[PDB]
């Protein structure tokens, strides 16, 4: 009275959710769907209570009446004395990353190159760069801008899925869940690391967390930061240490959404679950860590220090911020 039903997107998330459910003594249980939109529909039906969402997906969910409950908060610098749960979120930096060896690729020569995106409809992977590109080109044909891409959730026969690899059997090409090899922040970055794409739209933290031994995964373990450059909007290229002055946008942190009528109970249960399984949690690392998944960002980003309270009981528009909402709205006019 009552259990919270989390929605897991794809089978790797479903497995993590099932471990969480077991450890929480079924205080949390799991529904699973193949895509984040299908999870949003399970919550709208009442077949699930909540899930953690990128800002682009919060827009879809919020147009349908779901509300933000708690936000991811990653390691800060300022606000230091404040407990993680009470500290205001800082946003993350959406960036365009290329290889340093691909000399002379800039923001202004992206046309006809190969791109890697976290998925359609996500902030850094899609809404920010494609919104900027539609605006700059004066054209809605963003599906004709890059010669080939991996943009999970697009039509699998279209050139926006031509670079996606599917799963270890080569099935599920372009599905927008972690079974697609190039899904998400770490998939899109891998798509660039392997030179499948010329440019990856991810965030600043991705490049750091998957280079210089920060990841031990096969594909990442040998990557060096100095082999990558960020593309700035003024046409310059900078080292990845310069993301504060060479980003596309500042994104609102991923956050938990629920139906409005279950938001308070979801919130209470999550605060208690993170005291057990969170960053310094009573049962992490012995038993289960809610914010780890071997770099695969399952359910939550691996870099989440806590889920934090939101100030001002914000609506989804308030949480995303007016400017981002308007940019999404403008880009969605193309389709």
């Amino acid at each position: 009275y009552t259990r919270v039903v989390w929605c897991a997107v794809g089978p790797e998330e479903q497995k993590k959710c099932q471990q969480w459910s077991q450890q929480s003594g079924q205080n949390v249980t799991c529904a699973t769907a193949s895509t984040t939109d299908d999870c949003i529909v399970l919550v709208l039906k009442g077949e699930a209570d909540a899930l953690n969402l990128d800002g682009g997906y919060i827009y879809t969910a919020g147009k349908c009446g779901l509300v933000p409950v708690l936000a991811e908060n990653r390691k800060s610098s300022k606000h230091s004395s404040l407990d993680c749960v009470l500290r205001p979120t800082e946003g993350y930096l959406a960036v365009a990353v290329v290889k340093k060896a691909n000399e002379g690729l800039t923001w202004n020569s992206l046309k006809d190159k190969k791109s890697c995106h976290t998925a359609v409809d996500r902030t850094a992977g899609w809404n920010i760069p494609m919104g900027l590109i539609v605006n700059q080109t004066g054209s809605c044909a963003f599906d004709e801008f890059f010669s080939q891409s991996c943009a999970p959730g697009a039509d699998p026969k279209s050139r926006l899925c031509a670079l996606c690899a599917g799963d270890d059997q080569g099935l599920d090409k372009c599905v927008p869940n972690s079974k697609e090899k190039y899904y998400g922040y770490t998939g899109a970055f891998r798509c660039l690391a392997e030179d499948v794409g010329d440019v990856a739209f991810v965030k600043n933290d991705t490049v750091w967390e998957n280079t210089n031994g920060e990841s031990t995964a096969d594909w990442a373990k040998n990557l060096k930061r100095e082999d990558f450059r960020l593309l700035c909007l003024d046409g310059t290229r900078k080292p990845v240490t310069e993301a504060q002055s060479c980003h596309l946008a500042v994104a609102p942190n991923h956050a938990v959404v629920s139906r409005s009528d279950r938001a308070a109970h979801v919130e209470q249960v999550l605060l208690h679950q993170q005291a057990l399984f969170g960053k310094n949690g009573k049962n992490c690392p012995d038993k289960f860590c809610l914010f780890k998944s071997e770099t695969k960002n399952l359910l939550f980003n691996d870099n989440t220090e806590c889920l934090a309270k939101l100030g001002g009981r914000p609506t989804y528009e308030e949480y995303l911020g007016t400017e981002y909402v308007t940019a999404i709205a403008n880009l969605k006019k193309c389709s």
Binding site: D37, I40, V41, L44, T60, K63, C64, G65
Partner: peptide
């Protein structure tokens, strides 16, 4: 226009 997508 301004509605839910589902």
């Amino acid at each position: 226009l301004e509605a839910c997508a589902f």
